[PDB]
Amino acid sequence: RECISIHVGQAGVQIGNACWELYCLEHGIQPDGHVPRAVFVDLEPTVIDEVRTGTYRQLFHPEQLITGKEDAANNYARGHYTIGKEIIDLVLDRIRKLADQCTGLQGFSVFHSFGGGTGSGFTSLLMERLSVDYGKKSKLEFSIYPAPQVSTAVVEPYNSILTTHTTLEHSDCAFMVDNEAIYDICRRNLDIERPTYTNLNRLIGQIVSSITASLRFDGALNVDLTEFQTNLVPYPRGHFPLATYAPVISAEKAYHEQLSVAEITNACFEPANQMVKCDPRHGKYMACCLLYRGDVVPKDVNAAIATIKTKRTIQFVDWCPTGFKVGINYEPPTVVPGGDLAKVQRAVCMLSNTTAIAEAWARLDHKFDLMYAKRAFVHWYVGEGMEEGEFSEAREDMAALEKDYEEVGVDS
Amino acid sequence: REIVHIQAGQCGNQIGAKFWEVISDEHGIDPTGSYHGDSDLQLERINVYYNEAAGNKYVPRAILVDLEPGTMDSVRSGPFGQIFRPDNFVFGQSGAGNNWAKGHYTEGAELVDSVLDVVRKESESCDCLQGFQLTHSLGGGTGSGMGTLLISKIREEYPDRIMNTFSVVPSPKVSDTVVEPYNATLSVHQLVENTDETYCIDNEALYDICFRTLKLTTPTYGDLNHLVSATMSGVTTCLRFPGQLNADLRKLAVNMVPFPRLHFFMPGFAPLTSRGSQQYRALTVPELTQQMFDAKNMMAACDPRHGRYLTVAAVFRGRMSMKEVDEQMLNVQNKNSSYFVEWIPNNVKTAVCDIPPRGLKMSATFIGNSTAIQELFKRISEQFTAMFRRKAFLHWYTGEGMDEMEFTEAESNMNDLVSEYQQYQD
Amino acid sequence: SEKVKVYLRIRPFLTSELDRQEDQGCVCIENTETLVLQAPQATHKFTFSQIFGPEVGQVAFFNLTMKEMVKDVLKGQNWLIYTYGVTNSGKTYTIQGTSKDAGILPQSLALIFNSLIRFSVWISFFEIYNELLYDLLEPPSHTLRLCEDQNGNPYVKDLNWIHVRDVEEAWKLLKVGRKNQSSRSHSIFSIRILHLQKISELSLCDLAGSERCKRLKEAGNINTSLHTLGRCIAALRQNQQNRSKQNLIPFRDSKLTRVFQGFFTGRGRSCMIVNVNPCASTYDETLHAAKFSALA
């Protein structure tokens, strides 16, 4: 039932801060409430200190807030072998302690980014260990995907490749969201040219609330975390589904919240609203989970799905007859009063896995190989105790996934 | 994240005097007072450069090393010279002669013993030591000479920690010391083999910036050092405060040097306008990048237009959206792709902090590593050999204690560095 | 000139190896030039100059290249021997050898003295720890600097100078040096044959096998020196592959590469000897050892 979240990295803590804000807010709980079922770990004291002096300061406990007052950096090697294996022992203890307190936890909710140092290396060994101790648990992660062009680090794809190489075998489902795509939605739909980091995180939090919080609540058609992976991942490899929302309308400029189920659902099948840069170029739908929260009529959902099924424009996988997971909840999508979201009585959470991920991987992998070809900042990894072998093995594993995805669909 | 500052040489002490006069305003600390900062955010990061002890008296970890007693004496009698502890005053009343060998093999060697003790004392303070900051000129006894031995022992003692050095480059048009190129060649030799981070500050470029971009008729040395000090604070200090994308020395160096050949960086400043007529408030976003990537904004004599941008670290400090920043940087890389390196996806590492330099709305510090900086080394190399072949003032070095081959050791190394750069330029 | 020639050495089938786990046919021997990898399944093809073992002993390995090497060095040529291996790879047996079966070192000494007016044998032994070298030519108790000559190549300053009149003297030299040794560090043994009526240097290199396991940044530091050395070999490999290349050699990168620069920049043949175990469990060990030499 319960799911302990493990937010790691600067962006991980930032996104978690916004995510947890909505969580307690939509539950009608004040900052000075209940006990948060999540932990925050990073390598920069300033990042964690911000939470210890910001909003919901007394909502969290210092025990679930590890502060690595030594070094942070932005390289996988450092945040994994050198200083990464320093606080891992304590971190594992903290989560295990909480897991002992909970009443039959379903698994852990990982929150991090594929780029950076702490959000890459730490997560890799964390999930590695977690899958060894709690292998009989659901491993759901929300790995923030680096933008295709808008990279924040020079070694961005140099870390992501390694992260997705090791954790790929110690993960069940990795919900990927493109940071650049967040700007797109905010510009195209929200029509805002001032998207602060908090705004980007708030949009994802809105999704998370509908994936865990509300879904864990009693509805018309409940869906457990076990049902998630059982339908989302048809293979042993940790697949990366996309997180798409429906009510992305602004609360000022546009005002048409009275949209039918056939409209909101149809909005989750467009590149303009997918929350990822994986445009539907050749991405065959192998699994698509539709989580409806709010005023939702069962028949309306069935009709909406059928309408898309016979659309033909959206090509599905050949061996996939009916890869649609239906989820109907009762509580509507809660929105922050001082925000940009219009706030509707119904929302649709589209979680689909397609062959479009291949294009994303192909770009990221290419960007990595090009740098690796000239060695690049490899010396900054070698000195941390990491050998060339690790990078090469990662490249080979990534290539396998590149072929794997194209072997799942495409061919009949 | 504690950092210790060390000033070597007359020039180093003069620059440091300005740095600790500007950074004090950044943290809001009175000369011999306490925390008088406007806000409270500055207090949560004072341990980075200041050390706790008396409580009210926040002392700055800045060791002063110079063979010229007069230099340190003028600083200790200044408006901010009483904040320095007698412990940090590592003076040596010896031959302050402008000679590398003198401040390294003879007079410098004996004074280093005391320096090593003080540096160890300051390094074992609290929290976690990040690295060291050194200010020195490539044309002085204690500057280039002592600065060399200083960093050599520092890196040998703590090779785990980083080294952020500020190298004062001799003006190409009109140098100060006649033995400047000789000293510069010897300093750059150990620099590329010891320090990891080094910024190039030109003496003539400093005059140009304050003459064309600024409305300063007479750019005094203090004014020149002011500009540099106000720039360095936006690198180290600014990267210690909370913001959209918090960075750090490691986050910078590990995202700036593609190769372990040191790689010198060229500084710059976007909001470089006068207080009068230039107060147009033109600091939305495109104006920042426009001036940051300007050939006449470079703190170095060399222009990156003649070379290729290997890696650029853009550190912004103020309230701004990630969209307007990153998107603008992309436009720059796409428009100036001709010299932005095609073997690297993104060469501009963005960083946005949420704290401007007090009386400012928007600001951005420029730090770029370009292959065009080879023109600088080529200049020193040409100057060196020109007088080296004739052995102009070589006797001044041999008189103190220097090897005839030692001269070539530094020359061959500096020349080899230029080669490495040019190879990757084309 | 010649290319860096890499020879793979397979440790003779030891009881401890087979007793450890199922050694079986992890490493396969398909000709002396190439090796087939069937690591219990992992498929890989290892291409080397010449592979020796597990049947081929040390003597046969020495008689091949080293026997000729000694003669070349005595002539006044510069030769460098590279010896790499991780834990239990059997490096000691290959380089030093046993009591009965003398390894490359003792056997080389025999040939050195066999060539035996101007004949002075200078042997130096130093190890590197934390980018700092220490002269093992004697001392149990305690700056060393590389200066560069007009020739262009650097030399180790403050090194000790001992004459070796007898083979046993050279052997005793290493024994003492090995006692004051810092899995840690790289020690170099240099035997100079100075013949007059002429400078040649024969240097042995004991390279640490690299580690990803848990002094500051010791493993990472030595790992860097291992990679820099490899990059230098790779640069030369492709240099001789093509008619020409920029060949930016990372000599300056590590202190060891600068000592190596004397030989590597100058005229001299290089011998890359990597010794590994034929065991299946040691696949990770052997893999990293093979990755050092590189694929074709």
Ligand SMILES: CC(=O)O[C@H]1C(=O)[C@@]2(C)[C@H]([C@H](OC(=O)c3ccccc3)[C@]3(O)C[C@H](OC(=O)[C@H](O)[C@@H](NC(=O)c4ccccc4)c4ccccc4)C(C)=C1C3(C)C)[C@]1(OC(C)=O)CO[C@@H]1C[C@@H]2O
């Ligand atoms: C009324 C008003 O707004 O005055 C401004 C001002 O007129 C201008 C012209 C300032 C002014 O700066 C200079 O004239 C200048 C003099 C010598 C060398 C370099 C610059 C200013 O003196 C500088 C001062 O800068 C700061 O306060 C920053 O915090 C800055 N501080 C210092 O450099 C400093 C100066 C004296 C004592 C202690 C610190 C800083 C910058 C980066 C990192 C840390 C601190 C500012 C905004 C102004 C005045 C006061 C006129 C400008 O410079 C800076 C560094 O902000 C010059 O172009 C900019 C644009 C500013 O608008």
Ligand SMILES: Nc1nc2c(ncn2[C@@H]2O[C@H](COP(=O)(O)OP(=O)(O)OP(=O)(O)O)[C@@H](O)[C@H]2O)c(=O)[nH]1
């Ligand atoms: N959506 C979103 N993306 C963010 C946010 N913060 C950072 N990012 C993105 O995530 C990447 C930045 O990672 P960093 O902040 O450098 O590093 P980190 O992953 O926190 O870990 P370290 O490198 O060790 O500091 C870039 O691609 C940013 O664009 C945020 O608040 N929201």
Ligand SMILES: Nc1nc2c(ncn2[C@@H]2O[C@H](COP(=O)(O)OP(=O)(O)O)[C@@H](O)[C@H]2O)c(=O)[nH]1
């Ligand atoms: N920017 C700047 N340069 C300086 C200052 N003082 C000396 N210089 C430069 O430093 C060089 C001279 O070296 P100097 O500092 O006297 O050497 P030292 O004192 O013997 O170590 C010349 O190129 C000067 O332009 C200063 O306060 N600011």
Ligand SMILES: [Mg+2]
């Ligand atoms: Mg961070």
